[PDB]
Amino acid sequence: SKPQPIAAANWSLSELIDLFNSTSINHDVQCVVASTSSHLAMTKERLSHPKFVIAAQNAGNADALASLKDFGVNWIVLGHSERRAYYGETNEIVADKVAAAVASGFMVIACIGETLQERESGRTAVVVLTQIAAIAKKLKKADWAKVVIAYEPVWAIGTGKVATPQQAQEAHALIRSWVSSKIGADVAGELRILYGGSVNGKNARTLYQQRDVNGFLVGGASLKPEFVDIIKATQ
């Protein structure tokens, strides 16, 4: 059925780490904690759960990517909404960043998603396909084993306005079909497409039940104990 699911936290911090460490996860799930360099070290050494991995948020360049590795960070979050909005990161720039991360043996979480405006304008599909297509342009079939797609409606990020399950699934299904048709069924079949944007402990379970949802990218709810519930919704 579904490939291994991911539960990612996009960053009391020690309190949460302690909580995570004491937490028993019994199913096959990959947990991730993405942090700012500021808290990278701490998390790096406080976090000891076997099912958790730490991820970085951004790498300026080659040197930065190397130092991460030297530090043991093997995962990275790219193309997050604020980057695209306020950091001059265009579709193409993100694609290039995704490829450079891959080239350095990184596991990547590439984020995509439309704005409210794009959503009102009935332009969702195109936007989404355009963003993914620019990504796909710089990867080769084998590289896809290192990619994770995080679909996040910009209007749902931090707003309290989560996508209905029908919205999410429609989005995820679109992405997968394109992947399957442009890249290949095998890749498609294996690809983890996460949902992100106001996920919480109550809405998680229903979202996860959608055929094409493989987990989440969680901001707010990850700074709380409910995150644990988020992890369990992937059972």
User: Gaps in the chain (C–N > 2.5 Å) come after which residues?
Assistant: 11
> Nearest CA to 220 among 206, 204, 205?
204
List, in order, residues 6 or more apart from 116 with CB less than 8 Å away: 154, 155
Long-range Cβ pairs for the range 30-36 (8 Å, 24+)? 30/4, 30/5, 30/6, 30/215, 31/6, 31/7, 31/231, 32/6, 32/7, 32/8, 32/75, 32/109, 33/8, 33/9, 34/8, 34/9, 34/10, 34/75, 34/77, 34/109, 35/11, 36/11
Spatial contact of 140 and 99, defined as CB atoms under 8 Å apart = no
80 as an active site residue: the answer is yes
The 3-class SS string of 3-37 reads: CCCEEEEECCHHHHHHHHHHCCCCCCCEEEEEECH
Identify the active-site residue in 39, 80, 170, 172: 80
Q: What is d(CA 9, CA 11) in angstroms, rounded to the nearest whole number?
A: 6
Task: Quote the crossing angle between the two packed helices 91-103 and 124-136, to the nearest 10°.
Answer: 40
Instruction: Give the H/E segment covering residue 141.
Output: none
One CATH from 1.10.1270.20, 3.40.50.720, 3.20.20.70, 3.40.630.10 for 1-235 = 3.20.20.70
Radius of gyration of the chain (CA): 17
89 as an active site residue: the answer is no
Spatial contact of 146 and 102, defined as CB atoms under 8 Å apart = yes
Q: What is the per-residue DSSP string for 101-134?
A: HHHTT-EEEEEE---HHHHHTT-HHHHHHHHHHH
DSSP character for 163?
A: P
Number of neighbours of residue 130 by Cβ within 10 angstroms: 14
List of E strands, the chain? 6-10, 30-35, 52-56, 75-78, 107-112, 147-151, 193-196, 215-218
Considering all CA atoms of the chain, what is the largest pairwise distance in Å, rounded to the nearest integer?
46
Q: Which amino acid belongs to residue 28?
A: D
First-residue to last-residue Cα distance in the chain: 13
10 marked ligand binding residue:
yes
Q: Which amino acid belongs to residue 35?
A: S
Q: How many CA atoms lie within 13 A of 98 on its CB side?
A: 33
Structure-token pair, residue 98: 């995704």
